[PDB]
């Protein structure tokens, strides 16, 4: 009937958890105590980009380190110029309930999708001075919650129908599909080598995916609530998560463990975005109480605050070279910090 | 801004700003509505009367030179607790119920109780619709009763403020207003003077639903502004 399944369940549970607990010799705090911290840091607003009507949900830095893109509920994609505070392109959507956007590493395409079960592709470089749609992806059941680029031809999308899917832009059909999540998944973080990527869902569990074989590898658990922001360590061996219970955690791939947890008593709202710095020392995580925060990754301590947004923070980006940090919010202004 | 190229750059970035101004001017003069309901409820016919695995649908209706945009969510997952955050700026919610079934109404009551009390759905007034009333009449003149599933119907009396328009049968009106009050009890226990409930009695073909929506929206915006300007 059903007695066979649970027996194997606790069998595997006790087979894995004992080894996982035994591998944990000591916490990172003991080692990191000796390192001199960095102390107190000032960050100041250096620009303020204005022009969006409604709230803002996404942004993505370019490889050029000078261009960036953002999407809004009024149905707009706008491509800025971070140096001279200019606008380059203004793209109108078809479905106004957009939730994510991406900028191609080669700087040739952008993709967006949301509460229409479709991810679109816009071609920035053509012979006619326009930006047009070129490949519109249908096949998902739920809303799109994340999307990332591998190259000019392979794109990874995350959807509300509990399945991740690797696509092929040239033909428009999937080449792989990932299953294993009970609840709808919210975000995915690529690897620096573009051969693996982690995933997060509303199930308080994070998994590891391998593109080439299309099969899962590991499962990470420990959060008390759902996960709505994940970011991958620059080294290529760790990642950090963001939950709705005022908690951010650090995880290790090879060790299969849970590292320091970044929480404070005076915080009640839920994290919305997480990002690192070029050297991995700083973690920048915006919060629903109108304020971003910055932490010391090694010591798990607050070092200064970046206030100045009137409403919720929804997106957060750090340049490739570490020059500047851009923050977006529901009050429709992006503030650059340097 | 010294070389001619940067001058052409700022000229382009100004043209874009003018286009955004026009878009904002159009965006300011339009009201967005969210339509909710179940499968058995005739919300599939309300949209047709007013008028591919897609995820959302849009329909447009104009009354007295005011534009209303109502978004009906199509093929989505059952859980809505995650995609409901995108809708905390609309004017009102048009809830729909089929009051003929008498047994699959506890689910509707729980759904209303969940929608009304959502933390992101505060400050949003809800317009309640009670659909397919002729079926209730055609099911109640033969007697399948409501006492089978709602024992407390036996101690219910028609309130003095009731104004039965048809007058076909006192029991029809008693049961109708019983269901109305049963739905209305949910909103009264909370809401603390920030949002309301506007019940109605609708059937399949009712070419007055647009006017009801218009009047309810007008009476929501007026209350909001009066609250803002320290007059309520």
């Amino acid at each position, epitope marked *: 009937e059903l007695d066979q399944l649970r027996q194997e369940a606790e069998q595997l549970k006790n087979q894995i958890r004992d080894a996982r607990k035994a591998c944990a010799d000591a916490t990172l705090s003991q080692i990191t105590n000796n390192i001199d911290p960095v102390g107190r840091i000032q960050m100041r607003t250096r620009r303020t980009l204005r022009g969006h009507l409604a709230k803002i949900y996404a942004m993505h830095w370019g490889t*050029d380190s*000078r*261009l960036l893109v953002s999407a809004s509920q009024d149905g707009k994609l706008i491509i800025w*110029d971070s140096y001279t505070t*200019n606008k*380059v*392109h203004a793209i109108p959507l078809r479905s106004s309930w957009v939730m994510t956007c991406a900028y191609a590493p080669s700087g040739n395409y952008v993709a967006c999708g949301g509460l229409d079960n479709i991810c679109s592709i816009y071609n920035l470089k053509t*012979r*006619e*001075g*326009n930006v047009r749609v070129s490949r519109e992806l249908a096949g998902h059941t739920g809303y799109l919650s994340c999307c990332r680029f591998l190259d000019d031809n392979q794109i990874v999308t995350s959807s509300g129908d509990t399945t991740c899917a690797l696509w092929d832009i040239e033909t428009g059909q999937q080449t792989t599909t990932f299953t294993g999540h009970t609840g709808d998944v919210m975000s995915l973080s690529l690897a620096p080598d573009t051969r693996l990527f982690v995933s997060g869902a509303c199930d308080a569990s994070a998994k590891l995916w391998d593109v080439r074989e299309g099969m899962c590898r590991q499962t990470f658990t420990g959060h008390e609530s759902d996960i709505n922001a994940i970011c991958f360590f620059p080294n290529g061996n760790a990642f950090a998560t963001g939950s709705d219970d005022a908690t951010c955690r650090l995880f290790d791939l090879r060790a299969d463990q849970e590292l320091m947890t970044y929480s404070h008593d005076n915080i009640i709202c839920g994290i919305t975005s997480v990002s690192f710095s070029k050297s991995g020392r700083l973690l920048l995580a915006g919060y629903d109480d109108f304020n971003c925060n910055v932490w010391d990754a090694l010591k798990a301590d607050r070092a200064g605050v970046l206030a100045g947004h009137d409403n919720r923070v929804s997106c957060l980006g750090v340049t490739d070279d570490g020059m500047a940090v851009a923050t977006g919010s529901w009050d429709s202004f992006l503030k650059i910090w340097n | 801004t*010294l*070389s*001619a*190229e*940067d*001058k*052409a*750059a700022v*000229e*382009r970035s100004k*043209m874009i700003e003018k286009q955004l101004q026009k878009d904002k001017q159009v965006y300011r003069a339009t009201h967005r509505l969210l339509l909710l309901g179940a499968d058995n409820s005739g919300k599939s016919t309300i949209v047709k009367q007013m008028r591919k695995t897609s995820g959302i649908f849009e329909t447009k209706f104009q009354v007295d030179k005011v534009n209303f945009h109502m978004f009906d969510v199509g093929a989505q997952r059952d859980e809505r607790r995650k995609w409901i955050q995108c809708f905390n700026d609309v004017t009102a919610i048009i809830f729909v119920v089929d009051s003929s079934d008498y047994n699959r109404l506890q689910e509707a009551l729980n759904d209303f109780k969940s929608i009304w009390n959502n933390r992101w759905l505060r400050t949003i007034s809800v317009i309640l619709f009670l659909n397919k009333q002729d079926l209730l009449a055609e099911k109640v003149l033969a007697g399948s009763k409501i006492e089978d599933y709602f024992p407390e119907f036996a101690r219910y009396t028609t309130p003095e403020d009731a104004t039965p328009e048809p007058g076909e049968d006192p029991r029809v009106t008693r049961a109708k207003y019983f269901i109305r009050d049963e739905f209305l009890r949910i909103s009264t226990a909370s809401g603390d003077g920030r949002h309301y409930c506007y019940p109605h009695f609708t059937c399949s073909v009712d070419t007055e639903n647009a006017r009801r929506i218009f009047n309810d929206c007008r009476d929501i915006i007026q209350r909001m502004h009066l609250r803002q300007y320290e007059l309520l």
Partner: single-chain antibody
Amino acid sequence: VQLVESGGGLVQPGGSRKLSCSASGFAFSSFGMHWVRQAPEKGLEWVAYISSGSGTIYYADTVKGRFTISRDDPKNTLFLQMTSLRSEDTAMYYCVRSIYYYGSSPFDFWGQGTTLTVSSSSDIVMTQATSSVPVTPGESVSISCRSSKSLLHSNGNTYLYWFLQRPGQSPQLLIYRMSNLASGVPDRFSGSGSGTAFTLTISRLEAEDVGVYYCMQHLEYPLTFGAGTKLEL
């Protein structure tokens, strides 16, 4: 993308005639419409410049009180006006495009041009090194161009272009802003510079490369041109 203009010919001195350029196959409303003029036997030179939204209209020092350019954004047609033609009004008129934003490549597509014949300061001056060089199909070629003043700007950008008109063909674009390659020209071409003297270096060579090569500056409003360096087999 195809641009076509018609009209022109032989007129008596002092007349005024209207030239129209018709554009099809692209979003004309978002492009500038420079008028670069080529003398019947000499190098290129400017005539006018209207921006995309008709905001700014520069004119040429030689002709400013007689030449007016107008565009018809709906019908998508470009116009030129002249007054009291002199003997100099014999040169060649071409329809050029351009587009300015971060990372753009101005001066992309050129028209076929129209022919008109007439019966009987502090400008940055640039001069090219030579006028004719014999070459071998497979060797390495180099051309040099000189500018009176430094072209590099405070924002770290050098405004130099190499066109290389081919015989019997309208001009083209190879290298834009010193060290950047144009839209799918053969990769053998390249460019290098220092700030005042610049070199165009072709690695291999083919029968197509024959023609005349030009130099152009874009640091400040007036757009001066080089003389030309013909290559013969």
